[PDB]
């Protein structure tokens, strides 16, 4: 519905009821928004296709303990009754005001037998002054290290258009940890750390529809126009039907002769 597929990992207010779901069929809508605070997912379609084949997602706590540094992020945009933030992410602000951010190094080890999915965020404030208010002065630099992921990055404060009532943007980076691989986040400010790591449950098949859900068919493939229930080998409804069903053709209709070639009297 109003929740997006990626929002089931970060946790906007629209994605509360589907934060820890499990289904063999995932349905996304155009009104579904992936974000409450304005931001974007890097390498977005890969993560969307991963979440489509998740069979639902489980959440496991990371055990990331921060002592002496305030973590209760709050925004006027990602709101229900008061100013708050995402579900599975903690905003690492400064202590009380403009102050030095300690060079935190938090390591999480994937001890499960299935590959974990980890999503973290990078904050780019609406101005350099807002970044110093939130995290402090100095060139912040955050490294994310693993046996397969070693990419690092630098936050870039600057003015942005007012999207969803906020100026700054949080880029949502992600990786996949193998079992008994571990990840290390070394951040010295401007960090949206993960709270609960996401774990794949099984096999699903994600669709992107716009019609209401029914439970009356042994349906096989679905698309934005609905469901294509047919034993016929070819279809001409949608070219992007996902599932095991008839194939798309350019013809309006092909008429396969079952009877003989009749001639009238």
């Amino acid at each position, epitope marked *: 519905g109003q929740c997006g597929l990626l929002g089931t990992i970060t*946790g906007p207010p629209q994605c*509360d*009821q*589907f*934060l*820890e*779901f*499990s*289904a063999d069929l995932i349905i996304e809508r155009r009104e579904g928004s992936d974000v409450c605070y304005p931001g974007k997912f890097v390498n977005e379609e890969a993560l969307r296709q991963i979440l489509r084949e998740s069979g*639902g997602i*489980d*959440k*496991e*706590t990371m055990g990331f*303990t921060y*002592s002496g540094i305030r*973590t*209760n992020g709050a925004t006027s945009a990602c709101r*229900r*009754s*008061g100013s*708050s933030f995402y*579900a*599975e992410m*903690k905003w690492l602000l400064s202590n009380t005001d403009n102050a030095a951010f300690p060079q935190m190094t938090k390591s999480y080890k994937n*001890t*499960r*037998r299935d590959p974990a999915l980890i999503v973290w965020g990078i904050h780019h404030s609406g101005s350099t002054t807002e970044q110093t208010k939130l995290y402090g002065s100095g060139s912040k630099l955050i490294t994310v290290g693993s046996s397969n992921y070693q990419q690092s990055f630098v936050p870039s404060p600057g003015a942005r258009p007012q999207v969803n009532g906020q100026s700054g943007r949080i880029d949502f980076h992600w990786l996949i940890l193998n079992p008994n691989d571990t990840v290390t986040f070394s951040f010295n400010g401007a960090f949206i750390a993960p*709270d*609960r790591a996401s774990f794949l449950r099984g096999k699903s098949m994600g669709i992107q529809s716009g019609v209401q859900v029914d439970a009356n068919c042994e349906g096989d493939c679905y698309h934005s126009g609905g469901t294509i229930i047919s034993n016929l080998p070819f279809q001409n409804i949608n070219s992007r039907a996902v599932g095991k069903c008839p194939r798309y053709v350019k013809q309006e209709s092909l008429m396969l002769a079952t009877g003989m070639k009749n001639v009238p009297e």
Partner: antibody
Amino acid sequence: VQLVESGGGVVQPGRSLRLSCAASGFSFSNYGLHWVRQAPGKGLDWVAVISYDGTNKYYADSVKGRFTISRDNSKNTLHLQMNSLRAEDTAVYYCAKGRGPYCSSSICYHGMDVWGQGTTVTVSS
Amino acid sequence: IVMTQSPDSLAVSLGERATINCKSSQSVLSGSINMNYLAWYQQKPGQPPKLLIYWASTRESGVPDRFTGSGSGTDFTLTVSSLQAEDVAVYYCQQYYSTPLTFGGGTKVEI
């Protein structure tokens, strides 16, 4: 993460008592909080649920209209006020948080990830 | 709603198939999230009961893979593959799909 508790002791039935559960190591204002009891030798019994903002409060049928549950996110503490106690309230009280980020899902009364050490209260008759 | 349990303590030796059953008066599985709301707890004597599995199938990080939870609409099962000296406790099934939160009657295990 862990939660510390205080206020347990021996109190006469029908009196007033204050039961407080302080928390540390996590964002108190985010997770939902639960109050539960464990009778000595019997099974676990739920008492009350408070949400992240405290607007929604749910109580057991045996203590409905009797107790009240309050939290203060500024002081990082959780209170459970005692009024008009009776005999079968002799149990150890736990203030286990709910396993839910900011009252997610279709429920608000989640499970219980970690639990407090527990304070035992016993009435005298 | 009521969370009834299996029969009482079983004199099962180490490494046996430990089966605990929980029976539901209503259906806790909801058609929206399809995650089957139910939690299982183990309680040591003199120690607070820490959660073992959640949503009746999602195993936690602090527990081994021996505790497997099979969930359904009404009937629920924990199977423990092997029993050590650290697995002796009393077990509870708690529903949280609908108020009130009814815990189980308790299923202690005997080695």
